[PDB]
Amino acid sequence: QLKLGYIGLGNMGAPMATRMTEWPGGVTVYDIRIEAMTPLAEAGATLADSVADVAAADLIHITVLDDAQVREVVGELAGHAKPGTVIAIHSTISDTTAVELARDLKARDIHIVDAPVSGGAAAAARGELATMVGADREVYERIKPAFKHWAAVVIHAGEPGAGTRMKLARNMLTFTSYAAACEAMKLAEAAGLDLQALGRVVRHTDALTGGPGAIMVRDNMKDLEPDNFLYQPFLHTRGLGEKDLSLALALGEAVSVDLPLARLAYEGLAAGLGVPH
Amino acid sequence: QLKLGYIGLGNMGAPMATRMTEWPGGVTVYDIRIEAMTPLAEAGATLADSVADVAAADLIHITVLDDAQVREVVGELAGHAKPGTVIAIHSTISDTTAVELARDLKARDIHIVDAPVSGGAAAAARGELATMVGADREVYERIKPAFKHWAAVVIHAGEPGAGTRMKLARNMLTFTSYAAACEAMKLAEAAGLDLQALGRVVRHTDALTGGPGAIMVRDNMKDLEPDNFLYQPFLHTRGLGEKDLSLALALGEAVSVDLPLARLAYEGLAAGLGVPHK
């Protein structure tokens, strides 16, 4: 089994690394803060002296602040990594950084992989993360078993860079819906409602229904045609969506609250669902 | 103990009314469509001959198509229901509709409650619905044990009309977030990504994190002071969000896709979170 390395033990790095102490190949960890590393030692991780020390691992994980730090760390590992070594980047980077680093290191058999994760420290600890991976198919196949130890969902997104691109689509939804949630709270408050109660309803019902992902049941964005079994149901949902959004927008005007995300959604929903008017 | 009535056995009414066959009070049902009635019959429900027949019950549930139909059913019930009867409306109505019927029926000492529900037919069959209830305090307390049988989450949103209004806020989020999902799907596809996989990741991770509701943990919409327990977490969320949104917007420019919901989210997120820029 693959011997693991981990560099960067921050709020996601530490728990993934902790989960990797349960991996029979074992994990060698590094971070500059003595306090990020002490608990991993207690969990049974081998503590490394330096980034170069971690380069002896077969599969080296990196979760650091930004692209600049990733390049710095990758550059240091590259001086020592043996041929066949995989380097997985889990923290936030531009997709071009993954393309670039993979491209520069391929000739020395050092395989760069961008493998952003979602969602949560707790899930990381339990090995229930989703990861979206950009890699050579051959490289993806060799590391999948290792990835499956800490991720419940492992997607091969495409070549290096594709992982990042899938993460950007996924997280654009996350943060746009957070903005939408705050808009819903502003409306609720102007209506004299308990916002914490609303929050409880939303969270309970999204656990029942699955959440925003419930509408993601199409394999392309072509407009739906009447012969499609999905057609009448999406037509139905469009009617519901347009009704409820117009009702909400009317409430917004009644209680003097601007609702620009709702307004945009109201205008665009039909076209987005593939059932335009 | 309360004897139950149910009018409208459609895709939400039927599973709700089916759950109510397990209530000790029993349920009496009516729908004009025979094929809607028969399943409820073989689940142990009593079958009414008419809407007027259903008016004998203590607590009468209504789930039908639209306002116009809600107004008619309650108008029909109003001439037959005994004083003290409660009528609970679960289908879509305007927020003024609930108030109007409440005022209309005060005469007969018939109580109106707007109790929209969320989310799903499966939840409805299992008695795990959420319901947001506009009601006078005394009638809320009378019916709460009944509601608890088919709803795992029962909110007393306020007086009549308040249920509707909480529902409007809740479903605004539902459909704005579906809009955003479709925009995300458009981006993923232009970038050459697999939509099936994107959906699997979304649904899996939202099971873990809780979804958009995870951010709805504030009493009011005031800005967070530095010692607020949510300050550093929300500030961190603002940082992550603005970075991912900006990257997403740049990717959208690169693959020639318009991302207007994302642009608006990017500009307003910080303010929405109560940690605006200084």
DSSP output for chain B: -PPEEEE--STTHHHHHHHGGGSTT-EEEE-S-HHHHHHHHTTTPEEPSSHHHHTTSSEEEE--SSHHHHHHHHHHHHTTPPTT-EEEE-S---HHHHHHHHHHHGGGT-EEEE--EES-HHHHHHT-EEEEEE--HHHHHHHHHHHHHHEEEEEEEESTTHHHHHHHHHHHHHHHHHHHHHHHHHHHHHTT--HHHHHHHHHHHHHHH--GGGG---SS-PPPPTTSTTHHHHHHHHHHHHHHHHHHHHHHHHTT---HHHHHHHHHHHHHTT----
- Parse chain A into domains and list their residue ranges: 1-159, 160-277
In whole angstroms, what is the distance from residue B219 CA to residue B140 CA?
A: 23
Q: Is the distance from CB of A28 to CB of A134 less than 8 angstroms?
A: no
**Beta strand B111-114 with B117-118: parallel, antiparallel or unpaired?**
unpaired
- Chain B interface test: which of A183, A202, A234 (most B C-beta within 10 Å): A202
Q: Does residue A256 sit at the B interface (CB-CB below 8 Å)?
A: no
User: Strand, helix or coil at A269?
Assistant: helix
User: Strand, helix or coil at A240?
Assistant: helix
CB A264 to CB B269 under 8 A? no
Is residue A84 packed enough to be buried (19+ CB in 10 Å), middle (13-18) or exposed (0-12)? exposed
Pick the CATH number of A1-159 from 3.40.50.300, 3.40.50.720, 1.10.10.350, 3.40.50.700: 3.40.50.720
Q: Does residue B180 sit at the A interface (CB-CB below 8 Å)?
A: yes
End-to-end CA distance of chain B: 59
In whole angstroms, what is the distance from residue A22 CA to residue A16 CA?
A: 10
Place of tokens 């939202």: B206
In whole angstroms, what is the distance from residue B272 CA to residue A212 CA?
A: 19
Task: Enumerate the residues of chain A whose CB falls inside 8 A of the CB of residue B94.
Answer: 247
Instruction: Give me the catalytic one of B167, B186, B243, B278.
Output: B167
User: Strand, helix or coil at A40?
Assistant: helix
Q: Does residue B65 sit at the A interface (CB-CB below 8 Å)?
A: no
Amino acid type, A30: Y
Shortest Cα distance, chain A CAs vs residue B89, angstroms = 16
Sequence-separated (6 or more) residues with CB below 8 Å from residue B172: A180, A183, A184, A187, A244, A245, A248, A259, A262
DSSP structural state of residue A213: G
* Residue A38 Cα distances to A25, A44, A48, A115, angstroms: 20, 10, 12, 26
CA–CA–CA angle B254, B256, B257 (5° rounding):
110
Q: Does residue A118 sit at the B interface (CB-CB below 8 Å)?
A: yes
DSSP structural state of residue A79: T
Closest Cα to residue A95, out of A70, A130, A121, A128? A70
B148-162 per-residue burial string, b: 16 or more CB within 10 A, e: under 16: eebbebbbbbbbbbb
**To the nearest 10°, the Cα dihedral for B199, B200, B203, B209?**
-120
Shortest Cα distance, chain B CAs vs residue A82, angstroms = 32
Which of 137-166 (B) contact A at CB < 8 A? 152-153, 155, 157-158, 162, 165-166
Active site residue A167: yes
CB A155 to CB B201 under 8 A? yes
Breaks (C-N over 2.5 A) in chain A follow: none
Question: Resolution of this PDB entry, in A?
Answer: 2.2
CB B95 to CB A269 under 8 A? no
- Chain A interface test: which of B154, B178, B189, B255 (most A C-beta within 10 Å): B178
Q: Is the distance from CB of B60 to CB of B88 less than 8 angstroms?
A: yes
Q: Is the distance from CB of A169 to CB of B184 less than 8 angstroms?
A: yes
C-alpha of B255 from chain center: 37
Tokens coding A219? 């394999």
CA torsion through residues B35, B36, B39, B45, sign:
negative
Closest Cα to residue B11, out of B168, B154, B113, B120? B120
CB B208 to CB A122 under 8 A? yes
Q: Is the distance from CB of B72 to CB of B52 less than 8 angstroms?
A: no
* Residue A207 Cα distances to A50, A248, B69, angstroms: 43, 23, 31
Of A181, A210, A251, the CB nearest to B95: A251
3-state secondary structure A91-143: CCCCHHHHHHHHHHHHHHCCEEEECCEECCHHHHHHCCEEEEEECCHHHHHHH
Q: Does residue A269 sit at the B interface (CB-CB below 8 Å)?
A: yes
CB B197 to CB A155 under 8 A? yes
Residue B240: CB atoms within 10 A of its CB come to 14
3-state secondary structure B72-124: HHHHHHHCCCCCCCEEEECCCCCHHHHHHHHHHHHHHCCEEEECCEECCHHHH
**Beta strand B59-62 with B86-89: parallel, antiparallel or unpaired?**
parallel
Q: Does residue B196 sit at the A interface (CB-CB below 8 Å)?
A: yes
Closest Cα to residue A111, out of A57, A168, A173? A57
Q: Does residue B187 sit at the A interface (CB-CB below 8 Å)?
A: yes
Pick the CATH number of A160-277 from 3.40.30.10, 1.10.1040.10, 3.30.1490.20, 3.30.465.10: 1.10.1040.10
- Give φ, ψ of B223 to 5 degrees: -65, 145
CB B169 to CB A261 under 8 A? no
Task: Enumerate the residues of chain B whose CB falls inside 8 A of the CB of residue A169.
Answer: 184-185, 187-188, 191, 193, 198, 248
Q: How many residues does chain A have?
A: 277
Tokens coding B18? 């089916």
Query: Is-same-fold flag (B1-159; B160-278)?
Result: no
C-alpha of A90 from chain center: 9
In whole angstroms, what is the distance from residue B5 CA to residue B54 CA?
A: 6
CB A265 to CB B176 under 8 A? yes
Task: Enumerate the residues of chain B whose CB falls inside 8 A of the CB of residue A268.
Answer: 179, 182-183, 260-261
B89-128 per-residue burial string, b: 16 or more CB within 10 A, e: under 16: bbbbbbbebbbbbbeebeebebbbbbbbbbbbeebbeebb
Task: Enumerate the residues of chain A whose CB falls inside 8 A of the CB of residue B117.
Answer: none
In whole angstroms, what is the distance from residue A65 CA to residue A71 CA?
A: 11
Per the CATH hierarchy, to which homologous superfamily does domain B160-278 belong? N-(1-d-carboxylethyl)-l-norvaline Dehydrogenase; domain 2 (1.10.1040.10)
In whole angstroms, what is the distance from residue A83 CA to residue B215 CA?
A: 45
Q: Is the distance from CB of B7 to CB of B32 less than 8 angstroms?
A: no
In whole angstroms, what is the distance from residue A117 CA to residue A174 CA?
A: 13
Task: Enumerate the residues of chain B whose CB falls inside 8 A of the CB of residue A182.
Answer: 215, 221, 268-269, 272-273
- Give φ, ψ of A207 to 5 degrees: -70, -35
Sequence-separated (6 or more) residues with CB below 8 Å from residue A218: A224, A230, A274, B185, B195
Amino acid type, A18: T
Tokens coding B260? 């207007």
In whole angstroms, what is the distance from residue B71 CA to residue A153 CA?
A: 49
* Residue A168 Cα distances to A52, B249, B251, angstroms: 31, 9, 8
In whole angstroms, what is the distance from residue B155 CA to residue B97 CA?
A: 20
In whole angstroms, what is the distance from residue A166 CA to residue A99 CA?
A: 14
Closest Cα to residue A259, out of B266, B169, B180, B219? B169
Q: Does residue B239 sit at the A interface (CB-CB below 8 Å)?
A: no
In whole angstroms, what is the distance from residue A141 CA to residue A133 CA?
A: 11
